[PDB]
Structures are given as C-alpha cells and as structure tokens.
C-alpha cells in the first residue's frame, strides 16, 4: 500500500579539498530525516523525542562521513591533478602526459566509491528503518476525522523558511548569466584556435571549458527540478493542512510530502555547492587571461 | 578486547562511573553502545551512537568517549540500577 523508497557528482568548491555527493544516498537520508520528524511533531508525548531523533540523524550523517576515511587518500592524489595542471610549481616545470598520468583514474575514485557502496553494512537503510519505526508509533483516534498537525509544524519550521531563500536568488537570471560566460569563452576559443599554436595552453582552456560546460548542465538540470515551470499548481501544502481526513489518506500524504522534501533539498543543496565550484574555476579561467602578458 | 570490573552494587548516594579502556583500532574509530544485564534475565540497550537514548530508557544513564577511553555514567541510582552493565564495540584490526 504505502509506496516507500543516478549520476554522482564531484565537488571542489575550494582548491585543496574534495567531496562527492551520491545522489540516491542523499535523497534517502533526506526522505527519512523528513519523516522521523513528521511523526513526532504530530503527537504531544513525542515532542520529547525530538532531541533523540535529531541526535540519531546527526550520528547517521557521520558514520556516512566515516566512509570518506579511506576514499580520501586516493581523493587527495586526485587533487594533485591541480598541482600538475594549473599551478606548475616554481615556474620551471614545462601534452597528454598529465591527461593520462595517474590522472585518467577519476575512474579510480568512482571505483573506490562503488567498492564501499553496499559494502560496510548499510548506514542508508538504517534511516529507512528508524523513520518507518517512528511512523508506526502513532496515535490519535484514527477514525474518519484525524488532526492535520505534524506536516504544518515541519513546513513552517523547516520548509517555508528555505523556499523564500531560493525565490530571493532568482535562478533563471543565474543560468542566463552562466550561459553568456560560457558563450564568450567558446567564441574566444574559436579565435584562439584560428590564431595561436605554441607551448599550447589553449588545450587547458578547452579542457576547463568542457569541465565548466557539464557543471553548467548539472546546475541547469537541478534548477529545472527546483523550479519546474509546469507546476502542480505550486499549492500542495495548503491542500494537506487545516482540515481532517481518514487515517489511511493522511499517512499516504505524510509520505507524499516526505518525498517532495527529499528530492527538493537534495537538488538545492547540490545546486548551491556546484555554483560555488563553477565560479571557483571561472576565476581560474580568468587566471589564464592574467597570463596573457603581450 | 574491552575491559570492565564487576561492581554496580553499592548505593549510598551520587552518580557512578564505569570506565572503559581500549585501543586505536577499536574505540578510536568505532561507535560505542551500552547494555544492562539484570541477572538471569534478558539484557537491554540504553546507549547507542556513543550517547543516544532508547525510546523509554531514562536519561540518568549516559555514554561518553575521549580518544581510546569511553565511559558509561549513570546519575541517580536506584534498586533497579544495581545490575551488571556491559558495552559493545567493534575491532577493525582483528575483525570482530
């Protein structure tokens, strides 16, 4: 009855540190952090539990980060790509010599992620069980007319604050800005192709152009999810709250709203961090422009 | 691997400390849990994730950790609290 629960992106917001975000493994830990809470914030006795429910979710999102204990040294060696590529040290060190080196093995990282995926137990699934367990521990009468609290708590204390934060940063403008930056760097590439060709760091520009193009497509993809531009009627929360319904319906519709916040905050956390990385290496594109001493 | 002397049975008044020694490859990287044993009757969980309360169990019990040292720390003893209290932790080096 209750219908319970595709890329993987890598991130270097700063130059020096790297993390990855496994898209299924974040929506999951989001779904059941937006379910465990819903249950306890319906019932009065369970208002006591929210310290423990918080500290549970905290300690799951920490054991998860302990997987990044040995997907770390190879990550750091992957970072030493930037050492060889963009800042050749002491000015003296010199074509697809670094493109191959121990440097193709972005796949080495992707391996080590999948090497410790299901392996090492099931810290995901833990969140499923606990969120479901606390969803079982419910009361009210469960007659024809049950109370619609629960959802309204979580909305106005977690959701409604963040929706304003996103609408304030009009993403439609953000995309069109990023498009134009990419367009101009492509046009300059067209011309630099037609002109130059020695000690060729145009290939670096081609490479960084390529990298920033896919990163754009991801941010573009996430932004479309966050604001679709064909909508349920954007209302949904209003349909849920300030009413009474039968036990079956409300339980489905808790799980309904529990799903939305999973995928929403997934894409929106990613979008924000990807945007910080785009303009980290848009400034590194502009560092090469600062190396046009001519 | 872990160590623990048997004494949870003297109750004039105050809290109580159960210390727990260990090593790098066990306490140092892994999350500790704690259990109470009423003699000749099923054991019960109090603390998991180093310090978190099971649904029903009192806050008087509390776990802790500092490097290669952990401790269970009860506060406000009772007749019920006189028992045997054991811990649970994993050891990466010997795998068990």
């Amino acid at each position, epitope marked *: 009855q209750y219908h319970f629960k595709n890329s993987i992106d890598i991130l270097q917001e700063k130059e020096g540190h790297l993390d990855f975000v496994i898209i299924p493994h974040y929506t999951f830990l989001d779904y059941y952090k937006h379910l465990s809470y819903n249950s306890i914030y319906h019932k009065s006795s369970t208002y006591g539990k929210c310290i423990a429910v918080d500290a*549970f979710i905290k*300690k*799951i999102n920490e*054991a998860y980060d302990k997987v990044k204990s040995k997907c770390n040294d190879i990550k750091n060696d992957l970072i030493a790509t930037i050492k060889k590529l963009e800042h050749p040290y002491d000015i003296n060190n010199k074509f697809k010599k670094m493109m191959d080196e121990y440097n193709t093995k972005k796949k080495k990282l992707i391996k080590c992620i999948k090497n410790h995926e*299901n*392996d090492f*137990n*099931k*810290i995901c*699934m*833990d969140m*499923k*069980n*606990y969120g*479901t*367990n606390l969803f079982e521990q419910l009361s009210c009468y469960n007659n024809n007319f049950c109370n619609t609290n629960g959802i309204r708590y979580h909305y106005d204390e977690y959701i409604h604050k963040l929706i304003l934060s996103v609408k304030s940063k009009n993403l439609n403008k953000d995309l069109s800005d990023m498009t134009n930056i990419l367009q101009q760097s492509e046009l300059l590439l067209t011309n630099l192709n037609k002109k130059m060709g020695s000690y060729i760091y145009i290939d670096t520009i081609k490479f960084i152009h390529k990298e920033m193009k896919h990163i754009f497509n991801r941010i573009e993809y996430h932004t479309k999810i966050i604001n679709d531009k064909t909508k349920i009627i954007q209302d949904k929360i209003k349909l849920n709250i300030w009413r009474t319904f039968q036990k079956d319906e409300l339980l489905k519709r808790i799980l309904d709203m529990s799903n939305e916040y999973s995928l929403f905050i997934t894409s929106d956390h990613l979008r924000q961090m990807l945007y910080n990385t785009f303009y980290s290496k848009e400034k590194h594109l502009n560092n090469i422009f600062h190396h046009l001493i001519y | 691997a872990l160590t623990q002397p048997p004494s949870v049975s003297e109750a004039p008044r105050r809290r109580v400390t159960i210390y727990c020694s260990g090593s790098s490859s066990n306490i140092g990287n*892994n*999350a*500790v*849990s704690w*259990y109470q*044993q009423l003699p000749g009757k*099923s*054991p*019960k*969980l109090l603390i*998991y*994730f180093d310090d978190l309360v099971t649904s029903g169990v009192s806050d008087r019990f509390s776990g802790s950790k500092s490097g290669t040292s952990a401790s269970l720390a009860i506060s406000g003893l009772q007749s019920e609290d006189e028992a*045997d209290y*054991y811990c*649970a*932790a*994993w050891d990466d080096r*010997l*795998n*068990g």
Partner: nanobody, 120 residues
Framework: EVQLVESGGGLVQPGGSLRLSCAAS????????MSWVRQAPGKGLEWVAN????????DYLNSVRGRFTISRDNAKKSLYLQMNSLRAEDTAVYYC?????????????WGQGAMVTVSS
C-alpha cells in the same frame, strides 16, 4: 509483537552438529539486521556473528571462524545458526540477538536463549 523465540539447543558430544533457530513477527524481520550473542555460565557476553537483510555480508569472531554458519529465510522471518565441529568452550546460552535500525555493534533485543552444553 517483540518476539524472539529460540528453538533447539541441548547436549551433543565433542565435534557434533547443532543447528539453532529463531522466530519473530510484527517487526518485519526482512528489513532489519540480526546477530548471535552467547554467554557461558559464570562468564559474560560474547558476540558470535552478524548477517545482512539479504545475507550479502556475513561475519564471525576469530575462533569459530569457518565452523559456524549464519543464515536466514526472510520469507518466513527466521534466523538460524548451524554450528559444526562443536567444542566445549562453546558452552553458552545462545541468544538470537537482533541489531537496532542503526547498523553497528548494537543488540536491540534479546531472545530467551538456547542452552548449548558440550561435554562427554
């Protein structure tokens, strides 16, 4: 209902076969981790083994390694523990431990227990 019902367990001569069991209901057995824990008379607790929701991972201690065999049928909600080449150190009450929602070292609940004594 919080049910962990042991079946079997008894006495067999050194180097015997003995298969322990459990049953459960209410809490959906397939979705959660199980374990085994043992306690010898006049001795404290000792972890035996751990299993997965689909029996992907299996793990044991460092003495009965290869001897014991943890298994489960998740259609009938039933843990097992085939224990071959039995020794006398293996004298214990074998509790069908279940682990908590939170995967770790974490015996959520404990069954009544199966007395397994090993002697001539």
């Amino acid at each position: 209902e919080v049910q962990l019902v042991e079946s079997g367990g008894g006495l067999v001569q050194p180097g015997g076969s003995l298969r322990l069991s459990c049953a459960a209901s209410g809490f959906t057995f397939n979705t959660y981790w199980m374990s085994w824990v043992r306690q010898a008379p006049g001795k404290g607790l000792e972890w035996v083994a751990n299993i997965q929701q689909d029996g992907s991972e299996k793990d044991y201690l460092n003495s009965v390694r290869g001897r014991f065999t943890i298994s489960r049928d998740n259609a009938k909600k039933s843990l097992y523990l085939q224990m071959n080449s039995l020794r006398a150190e293996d004298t214990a009450v074998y509790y069908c431990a279940r682990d908590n929602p939170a995967s770790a070292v974490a015996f959520d609940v404990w069954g009544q227990g199966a007395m397994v004594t090993v002697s001539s």
